[PDB]
Amino acid sequence: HFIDQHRAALIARVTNVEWLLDALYGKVLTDEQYQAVRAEPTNPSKMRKLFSFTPAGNWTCKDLLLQALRESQSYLVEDLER
Amino acid sequence: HFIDQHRAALIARVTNVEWLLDALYGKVLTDEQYQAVRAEPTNPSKMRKLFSFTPAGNWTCKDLLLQALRESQSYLVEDLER
Amino acid sequence: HFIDQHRAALIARVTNVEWLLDALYGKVLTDEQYQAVRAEPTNPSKMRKLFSFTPAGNWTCKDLLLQALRESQSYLVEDLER
Amino acid sequence: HFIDQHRAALIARVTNVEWLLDALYGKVLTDEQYQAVRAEPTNPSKMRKLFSFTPAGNWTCKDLLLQALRESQSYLVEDLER
Amino acid sequence: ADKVLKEKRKLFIRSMGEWTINGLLDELLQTRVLNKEEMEKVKRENATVMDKTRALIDSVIPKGAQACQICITYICEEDSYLAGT
Amino acid sequence: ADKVLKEKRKLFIRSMGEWTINGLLDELLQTRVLNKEEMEKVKRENATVMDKTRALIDSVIPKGAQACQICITYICEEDSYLAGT
Amino acid sequence: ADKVLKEKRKLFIRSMGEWTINGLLDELLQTRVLNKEEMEKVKRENATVMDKTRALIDSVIPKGAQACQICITYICEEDSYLAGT
Amino acid sequence: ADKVLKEKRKLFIRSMGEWTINGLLDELLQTRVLNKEEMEKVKRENATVMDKTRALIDSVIPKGAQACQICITYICEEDSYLAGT
């Protein structure tokens, strides 16, 4: 549920979407999703399309995203726990 | 035609839509259609708009398209024959 | 009447809809109309929505559009006079 | 009102969108808006997106933009006086 | 009078490359063929000598009465092995 | 075998460098798999070495990936760090 | 403190050089803020100093309290005409 | 006068040299018609052989119509073999 709370945060914060995008390729994001999200001009808008492409309540996809965040920058997880 | 059979592959596969677009210009479609196809962000969506302009009953244009496919990427066509 | 005589041609001939838009913004086009015209991807369709906003008897806007066309390309303006 | 009058010039006259960007980022542009404007290809298109963020009724944002123009390029500003 | 010279030589310009490409488009700027903004728009596109060429080719919609041709004369001042064919 | 090559991973192919990527694109051009355009598109548009590599990964040539044993064999020619060589 | 740092800091990061930038990247990488790839992306950004700075500042966007602080403290050991107090 | 000065001598200023270019941008910063930023980008990022010119040609869009006189007078400091100088 942490994720949903930073579903809002990260859409306005993270700037490394293209790398996280990897963590979901085929796992959760097919090429139709992938290209669409990549085509967006801003990192905020890239995340906006991305999170509308993961409407699954499945914890797996959320957990994969978190692991991606942990392996990408490793900072936002503490910064959003506050 | 195989192309009619395998168009679902084509929309998701052929990553040089712009080259194909060149051949279909003066010979097949009106340039308004050129710009239209070029506009949408993804290669899958670019092909989707392309096939919506291309009449399935127009066999002649389809032949030129096949030759274009053969000259464009030249490996996918043989993998589609297989 | 210059416009009503060439509307079909120039809808599909001039590329720089956005440049033409600048003059219109100053005189006639409100910001809502500006954004509307800009939101069309393809230049022929972008002009089509522009001329759909200005198909009335207002001669000032029509007249300023001619001068804009003269200052836009200076090539198509002579080519359509011929 | 001076800037609103001459935006048709300025959209296609001043080049250094990035300098202008700094002041607006502080006052009006949020980070998502900053990225949006930056993603646009041409200085004219960059300014076009900038003025779409700028509220027409706001003197403050207009005034900040003018000061930015003066501190980036006041020699365009002197050519505007002329 | 010049449209066909490219209507039938379109894809040919998909082989035209090099800094001859910039040069090809900065003559059209001097004349009223391309605006500063359109010149900027073509330059801000990021293909190597490919979409560039298709952008100038998008500027042939104008009856190239003296435009389409001004391109052709610049092509003539270069070794146009495509024209030579 | 081909299907596994088509998936494998990206993060592992993402953990590469220059002096392999350059040689990969050279061969992919010369093996006629991608034309000049894709070579230009990868080398010009996709600046970020990673972005470049994700672009070659978009040259997985979807169900054209019998050519991707040209890629795998080039990986075999050099130091393979991937478990799925 | 934290929010104040960044708006005032785009404000003053326009007064700088490359000695500074080069060193900045080394510490921001080693303080685990971002990967080698983003450091590579900023270094291979098609600008000189200026847009690269706006890029580092796009790394302070997700930044938390300590993420701004590591940058500002690195600024501290030099002449901070940036007015870093 | 100012409008004419840009109108032409562009292909002609495109056949200029680093000697003049190097001196020119230094003085354009000094005369403050040119900002620190753009000159800083153009000298490295743009092509050396040619784009060097297109850089000051990015002043042609009124970054100083009075600067057209400043440019021509700087040209007068050396061999103004171009017409209108």
Author numbering:
A (entry chain C), B (entry chain B), C (entry chain A), D (entry chain D): 113 to 194
E (entry chain H), F (entry chain G), G (entry chain F), H (entry chain E): 2 to 86
Excerpt from the publication:
Specifically, we designed the type IIa W169G mutant of ASCCARD and the type IIb G20K mutant of caspase-1CARD and connected them in one polypeptide chain using a 5× GSS linker. As expected, these mutations did not impair the formation of an ASCCARD–caspase-1CARD oligomer, and multi-angle light scattering (MALS) measurement revealed a main peak of molecular mass of 86.3 kDa, corresponding to a tetramer of the ASCCARD–caspase-1CARD fusion protein, or an octamer of CARDs with 4 ASCCARD molecules and 4 caspase-1CARD molecules. We then determined the 3D structure of the octamer at a resolution of 3.9 Å calculated by FSC between half maps. There were eight CARD subunits in the map, four of which are similar to one another but differ from the remaining four, suggesting that there are four ASCCARD and four caspase-1CARD subunits in the map. The ASCCARD and caspase-1CARD structures were clearly distinguishable by their fit into the densities; in particular, the shorter α6 in caspase-1CARD and the longer α6 in ASCCARD allowed unambiguous placement of ASCCARD and capase-1CARD subunits. In this assembly, there is one type I interaction and three type III interactions within ASC subunits and within caspase-1 subunits, and there are three type I interactions, four type II interactions, and one type III interaction between ASC and caspase-1, which must have represented the optimal mode of interaction between ASC and caspase-1. In all three types of interactions between ASC and caspase-1, ASC always uses the type b surfaces (Ib, IIb, and IIIb) to interact with the type a surfaces (Ia, IIa, and IIIa) of caspase-1. Of note, this arrangement requires a tetramer layer of ASCCARD to interact with a tetramer layer of caspase-1CARD, suggesting a hierarchical, rather than mixed, assembly of these death domains. Extensive type I and II interfaces dominate the ASCCARD−caspase-1CARD assembly, with calculated buried surface areas of ~450, 600, and 220 Å2 per partner for type I, II, and III interfaces, respectively. Detailed inspection of these interfaces revealed several clear interactions between ASCCARD and caspase-1CARD.
